[PDB]
Design a binder for this molecule. Structure first.
Ligand SMILES: CCn1nccc1CNC
Ligand SMILES: [Zn+2]
Ligand SMILES: [Zn+2]
Ligand SMILES: [Zn+2]
Length: 457
């Protein structure tokens, strides 16, 4: 059972107001046929337009909420809404567009999906709360057939052009008019009681309902993300590399060792309380400090309450607390914190549920909304590079580095050596990479890098 069988049953109750008299007994085979499509018994990689929940989760980057609301049905104009906030009006002659014929509307759909998805995924997955008109309107902008490759590259074809009779991926589809071999999933098939708004509003207060198609498309995809990533967590699913994943992760490890090593040297804490990932390793293995670990998985729903993490059914005020990607409601004053900023715009960070975001880097992690009040007892950690390694070149060109934040023996004694200048510029690069990826660094208010210069005597 790799793909969804076309002979699987489809509950049609959600479709009977737009489609009166719809048979209660219905398969994907008959539904696809009713949508105007013909599969012709094809063993060419596209077995079903509809996919399983497991296949949807593996392709979460391809999710596009899609809803159709009749304005006035081949006689009436339809309002097409996408979770990108777009609203197109198609006439059969929250960005709102006036009524236009299908032949131009379809050109807009290809442009929009291609610009949204080219850097996220090899496909589109239409996430639906199916009532009828979205499924019947698909014949006006979708073409299906065997799996194909792009005319200009080796990626799979996601668009077709009737003008040139050719196929293209999301990167080479300028001027293409048809969505080719899209996927889709109906959230109503998962077994919900009540309408979309009642189920969405149980977990999310950020998305409202103006009553436009895009508000529904947004609520649909948000509810799907809550079911698949907030209340159900699968950290075994691996996602492909689509950007700077490897560099961001390497940078995170470099920054962690640096910031923690310098806090232990500056304030000489006797104990460090490492709260977070149960698979954590000591980031500063040579530090003298008593290292104590506390297990707390990444919270995907609401941020951890510090009152529950610290409750003993043990002296957290002694030494320092390390919360590296451990999202709590209010950090204690003696803390070193890395907190992912859910507001960040990137190909890795997808929109989420209740203000949160879906950070996808090797694994998918729904992160609770960034909250500035979490850090009231702390301050923003400033950039600095620290090194006690010998000043020795070994082995790229050079311009002399002058910086007040290069905390080294060579800078203390006047001129920064070539080694520490190379290492400083590489560390600053990793630092900017981690910050731009969305991570934010916070530290206890007494943290002062002036205390690092005396470690050179
Ligand atoms: C470190 C505090 N502690 N002791 C037992 C269990 C826990 C965690 N909070 C529930
Ligand atoms: Zn291409
Ligand atoms: Zn929502
Ligand atoms: Zn040096």
């Amino acid at each position: 059972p790799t793909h969804l069988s076309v002979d699987t049953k489809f509950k049609t109750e959600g479709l009977c107001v737009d489609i009166p008299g719809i048979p209660k007994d219905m398969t994907y085979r008959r539904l696809i046929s009713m949508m105007g499509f013909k599969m012709n018994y094809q063993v060419n990689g596209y077995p079903n337009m509809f996919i399983t929940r497991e296949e949807a989760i593996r392709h979460v980057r391809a999710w596009i909420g899609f809803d159709v609301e009749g304005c006035h049905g081949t006689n009436l104009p339809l309002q097409l809404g996408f979770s990108t906030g777009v609203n197109l009006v198609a006439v059969p002659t929250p960005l709102m567009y006036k009524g236009l014929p299908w032949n131009v509307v379809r050109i807009k759909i290809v442009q929009m999906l291609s610009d949204t998805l080219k850097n996220l995924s090899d496909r589109v997955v239409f996430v639906l709360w199916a009532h009828g008109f979205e499924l019947t309107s698909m014949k006006y902008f979708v073409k299906i057939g065997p799996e194909r490759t792009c005319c200009l590259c080796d990626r799979r074809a996601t668009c077709f052009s009737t003008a040139s009779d050719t196929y293209a991926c999301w990167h080479h589809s300028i001027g293409f008019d048809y969505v080719y071999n899209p996927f889709m999933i109906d959230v109503q098939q998962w077994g919900f009681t009540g309408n979309l708004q009642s189920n969405h509003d149980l977990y999310c207060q950020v998305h409202g309902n103006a009553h436009v198609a895009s508000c529904d498309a947004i609520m649909t995809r948000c509810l799907a993300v809550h079911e698949c990533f907030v209340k159900r967590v699968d950290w075994t699913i691996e996602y492909p590399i689509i950007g700077d994943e490897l560099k961001i992760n390497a940078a995170c490890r470099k920054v962690q060792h640096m910031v923690v090593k310098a806090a232990l040297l500056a304030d000489k804490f006797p104990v460090l309380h490492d709260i977070g990932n149960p698979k954590a390793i000591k980031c500063v293995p040579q530090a003298d400090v008593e290292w104590k670990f506390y297990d707390a998985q990444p919270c995907s729903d609401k941020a951890y309450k510090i009152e529950e993490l610290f409750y003993s059914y043990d002296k957290f005020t002694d030494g320092v607390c390390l919360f590296w990607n451990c999202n709590v409601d209010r950090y204690p004053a003696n803390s070193i914190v890395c907190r992912f900023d859910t507001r960040v715009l990137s190909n890795l960070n997808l929109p989420g549920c209740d203000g949160g975001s879906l950070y996808v880097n090797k694994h998918a992690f729904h992160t609770p909304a960034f909250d500035k009040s979490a850090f009231v007892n702390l301050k923003q950690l400033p950039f600095f590079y620290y090194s006690d390694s010998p000043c020795e070149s070994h082995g790229i060109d050079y311009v002399p580095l002058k910086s007040a934040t290069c905390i080294t023996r060579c800078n203390l004694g006047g001129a920064v050596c070539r080694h520490h200048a190379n290492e400083y510029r590489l560390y600053l690069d990793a630092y900017n990479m981690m910050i731009s990826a969305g991570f934010s660094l916070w530290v206890y208010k007494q943290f002062d890098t002036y205390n690092l210069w005396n470690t050179f005597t």
